[PDB]
Amino acid sequence: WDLTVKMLAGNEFQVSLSSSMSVSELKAQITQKIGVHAFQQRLAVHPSGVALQDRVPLASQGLGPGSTVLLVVDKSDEPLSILVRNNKGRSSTYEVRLTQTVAHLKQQVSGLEGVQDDLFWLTFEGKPLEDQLPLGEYGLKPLSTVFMNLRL
Ligand SMILES: [Os+4]
């Protein structure tokens, strides 16, 4: 549908939802417009003033065509240290930013483990990480442990 995104810091712009129309799709539109990552987006329904449900559909959330949502962007991109456990079980500390991509992390890991980046993939809390997405998308925190998986 046609949705208005009002910023407390900016002005406002429209967006269109074309499919199941979920919270993710919305953020994908925001990113399309201002280039800010999804995980850096803070959204609330206007004027109810309540944050959105990442699981609940926009429809059954008091949002539809002509509705307004409030957006505040998180700028900060301070480095933090995370752990990556290798095949043998040994973990190593990496200094990263939540805005860097999984692919970038892999390159770092690869360079440190002397293993071609294409011979393994990474996982966190059982779910694999996608090369094109930013680390912040998986809720990594200090000393979080990401696992290396050999494509053997
Ligand atoms: Os404004």
| DSSP assignment string, the chain | -EEEEEESSS-EEEEE--SS--HHHHHHHHHHHH---GGGEEEEEETT--B--SSS-SGGGT--TT-EEEEEE------EEEEEE-TTS-EEEEEE-TTSBHHHHHHHHHHHHT--GGGEEEEETTEE--TTSBGGGGT--TT-EEEEEE--
Domain ranges of the chain: 1-75, 76-152
Query: Please, what is the end-to-end C-alpha distance for the chain in angstroms?
Result: 46
> How far lies 147's CA from each of 56, 78, 88, in Å?
30, 23, 11
Based on its alpha-carbon atoms, the radius of gyration of the chain, rounded to whole angstroms, reads 18
Dihedral sign (CA 134, 139, 140, 141): positive
Does domain 1-75 fall into CATH 3.40.50.300?
Answer: no
Cα(70) to centroid(ligand 1), Å: 9
> How far lies 112's CA from each of 20, 93, 94, in Å?
42, 11, 10
Residue 82 Cα to chain centre, angstroms: 17
Elucidation method: X-ray
Cα(69) to centroid(ligand 1), Å: 12
* CA 45 – CA 124 distance, rounded (Å): 31
Does domain 76-152 fall into CATH 3.90.550.10?
Answer: no
- Do 43 and 51 form a contact (C-beta atoms < 8 A)? yes
- Do 66 and 58 form a contact (C-beta atoms < 8 A)? no
Cα(119) to centroid(ligand 1), Å: 48
- Ion ligand 1 residue ranges (Cβ < 5 Å): 11
Buried b (16+ CB within 10 A) or exposed e, 3-23: bebeeeeeeeeebebeeebbb
Nearest-CA neighbor of 4 among 69, 73, 60, 49? 69
Cα(73) to centroid(ligand 1), Å: 13
Cα(23) to centroid(ligand 1), Å: 21
The domains spanning 1-75 and 76-152 adopt the same CATH topology: yes
This PDB structure is determined at a resolution in Å of 2.5
Give the tokens for residue 6: 């009002």
- Do 62 and 48 form a contact (C-beta atoms < 8 A)? yes
Cα(5) to centroid(ligand 1), Å: 9
Cα(6) to centroid(ligand 1), Å: 6
- Do 152 and 118 form a contact (C-beta atoms < 8 A)? no
